[PDB]
Amino acid sequence: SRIPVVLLACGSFNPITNMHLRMFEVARDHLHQTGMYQVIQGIISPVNDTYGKKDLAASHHRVAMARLALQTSDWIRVDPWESEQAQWMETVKVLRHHHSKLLRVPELKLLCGADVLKTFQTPNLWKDAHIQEIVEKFGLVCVGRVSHDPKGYIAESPILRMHQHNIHLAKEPVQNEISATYIRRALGQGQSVKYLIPDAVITYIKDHGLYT
Amino acid sequence: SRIPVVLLACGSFNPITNMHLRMFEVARDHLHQTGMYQVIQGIISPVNDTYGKKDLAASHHRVAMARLALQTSDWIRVDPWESEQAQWMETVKVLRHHHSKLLRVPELKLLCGADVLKTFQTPNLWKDAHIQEIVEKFGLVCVGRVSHDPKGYIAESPILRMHQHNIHLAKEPVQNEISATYIRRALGQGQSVKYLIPDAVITYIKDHGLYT
Amino acid sequence: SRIPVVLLACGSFNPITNMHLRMFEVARDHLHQTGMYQVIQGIISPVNDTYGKKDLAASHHRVAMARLALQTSDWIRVDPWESEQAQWMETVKVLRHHHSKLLAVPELKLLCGADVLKTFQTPNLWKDAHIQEIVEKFGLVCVGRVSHDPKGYIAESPILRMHQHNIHLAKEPVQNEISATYIRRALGQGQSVKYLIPDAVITYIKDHGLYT
Amino acid sequence: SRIPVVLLACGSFNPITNMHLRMFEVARDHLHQTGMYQVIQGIISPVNDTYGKKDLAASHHRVAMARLALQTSDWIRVDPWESEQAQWMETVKVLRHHHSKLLAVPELKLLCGADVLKTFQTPNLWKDAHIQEIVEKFGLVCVGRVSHDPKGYIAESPILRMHQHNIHLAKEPVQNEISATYIRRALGQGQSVKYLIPDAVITYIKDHGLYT
């Protein structure tokens, strides 16, 4: 039989876009095609407001938009636990929390774009122990992105190449390079982003005067 | 004051995708930014079933999906006149028909991707008289696409470069290369296309067993 | 052992670019990786000057630029035969000519980008009999291009589908969408195209005042 | 008259690629088109071997490959100073060094891709004071990359926004996303990278058995 899998995606979702959503769909089809897994749930976990330095919309707004974006999904949901904590938390700690909730068994895997995968190399950006825990205790499903070579990132990492069984590279045959930065700039200029992010999210943004 | 403009997009829309929809939004923002125009309406006109040679879904299905895709649009509508004619018709003839309907005044412009623009060069593909009529009697709004250089296509065409005032090049700052061919293949393989085309269109496709 | 193969690329090569050259390298590695072919030669065949609408540099110059571009290749050569003929010739006839030239015969295959494969669908562009002879008697090696879905083009064409074993889809994780159209426009504006086309080609264009 | 400018590109150049070289040409044409600058020299400065996690070819080889790649450039040279230092140095210190070297002084500007500009946002990556000194005392010329929105990065950073007059955004309608990571993987698999990196660089890699 197949192994139950839960996909967890961390990030800003400022705001959530059709690309963030597509990422789950591609990752699920990929895992199913292997024959070894059955994805049972997707979780969008927006980052906390204390995180880094940037014009991030308040967390309850990002959580609300993600919930709206996901109303037509029968398997992906937003979980505000991370954004509701007092302070920002390293990714691995969010994975532990959700793993615990699962035990109250499905394998919990981190879901991300190939660009996040490239950051594992940035000096003083990720503790090696954390990278090891992600691919050894949990798993990693990476969706391709233009200009990134996930296969090489894995091969050149002493930690990643040792845990390839738990790293899944999902190929994105559709060029969809929507960046939320662009979405925010467009909105600020009063330009349309319809068909780039969910209609309901656009409505929420307008109703609450976000990204003006 | 501004000149009223109606945008007309011909094509297969087999099925309509989020990219076809985005094309209208980008074209409208572009024309408005010039200050010279006010886009008052968008029209999706699906090609007739006698057209060329291919696995085209029945026209009433393509019209229905486009209508569903456009339910959340307050300015773009589908017009089945073209698909309802007895036989396929050259683009310019569809422009004449819609121009007539407008008179029962707004400028009617053809809307298309930069790839369509490149076909103007293909031997025995477009009558020069028709290309001239399009950019001289009507107008052309072209949305950019990866690998195409609209500015060069215009400059190298003796007909197009003489009517640049009526040709509008709208830039697409977002890499969104979704092809309907891929959508159909994915659907046939039972893969997800959610977030690539409208939810309602996906439902219609499933309900009517299209692209199996 | 392996079936010997010769690759033939037809096109404008106005001017030849690094992408046109990359196309050969990608196709050769793909055929070799199948384990059953050995590519022994590549042929660049610039189109005749009587062809099409677009105004191209003289074939004398396009052949010269290809020769210069190919000085550092040990397996690809330019063949002027096609451009030296009194008038434009259909692709199938150029294949027949080069096949005769090879007369334990190697297989001669047409090398092209996925955009060319999509034109097989265009009404009144290719004679069905030519499409059949090309994929059945010669073979097609298609290199991927953004926005094109070769697999779908093949599945939706009864002729390509029936002979799909003779169509080899090659691709690399590199987004290299440089159009010669852009190249000419840039040259016309006095901008650099260094590192987009070979240094030797740029020298010839400057020395002979082309693309002004 | 025009302000003389020197462009400095820092990075791994592991190995230097046609895209790294194209970056200089695009930046120079952009600065010249503003009508107020005259680019007099370009400097490629390979990073020190003590830098980061990823295992890079020896700096001796990366400097050699850049020198060979640059033999056909009449304005860009490689400068080994940075890689010859006992240990890795922050970008701002390399700029200061080269600025001193130039000591009616030309303006020295950092040349990079938009992805680098996005890293300014990363928590604990750059010292705010360094970001300020880079954009205020030197200048930044950023070349566009797919998926990045430089204009938005600048608008959302108070430091970049305040000094945006010293940040020059250059870009060309060419999708050239070749990653050196892909290059190394391909070389490791015995595949061709001809026409993606200079011929002279490929010869050196083969002669010295690099990237095995």
Ligand SMILES: Nc1ncnc2c1ncn2[C@@H]1O[C@H](COP(=O)(O)CP(=O)(O)OP(=O)(O)O)[C@@H](O)[C@H]1O
């Ligand atoms: N267009 C795209 N294609 C594939 N993955 C994408 C994507 N856009 C975002 N992602 C992925 O979605 C996850 C969350 O992204 P975010 O944290 O919201 C940064 P972003 O989406 O790039 O917006 P930004 O421009 O504000 O940084 C990441 O794993 C990222 O890789």
Ligand SMILES: Nc1ncnc2c1ncn2[C@@H]1O[C@H](COP(=O)(O)CP(=O)(O)OP(=O)(O)O)[C@@H](O)[C@H]1O
């Ligand atoms: N991803 C995209 N980006 C920009 N324009 C697009 C686009 N996809 C389609 N278009 C435009 O939408 C209009 C209609 O396209 P269609 O006639 O449906 C062919 P298509 O969308 O490429 O599907 P196909 O693969 O079945 O041919 C054309 O003007 C085309 O240029």
Ligand SMILES: Nc1ncnc2c1ncn2[C@@H]1O[C@H](COP(=O)(O)CP(=O)(O)OP(=O)(O)O)[C@@H](O)[C@H]1O
């Ligand atoms: N960037 C690219 N990637 C892959 N194949 C490409 C390519 N650019 C061109 N080709 C292929 O190279 C062959 C010859 O192309 P040409 O006939 O010269 C037209 P082109 O190269 O698109 O320039 P154009 O802008 O003048 O039309 C074709 O098979 C085409 O598909």
Ligand SMILES: Nc1ncnc2c1ncn2[C@@H]1O[C@H](COP(=O)(O)CP(=O)(O)OP(=O)(O)O)[C@@H](O)[C@H]1O
């Ligand atoms: N395809 C491309 N287009 C524009 N800029 C590019 C580029 N590829 C790399 N660059 C730029 O070239 C400079 C040096 O890059 P490097 O430090 O060598 C990392 P890289 O080139 O991405 O290879 P990598 O895959 O090993 O990381 C950077 O400013 C980077 O932004």
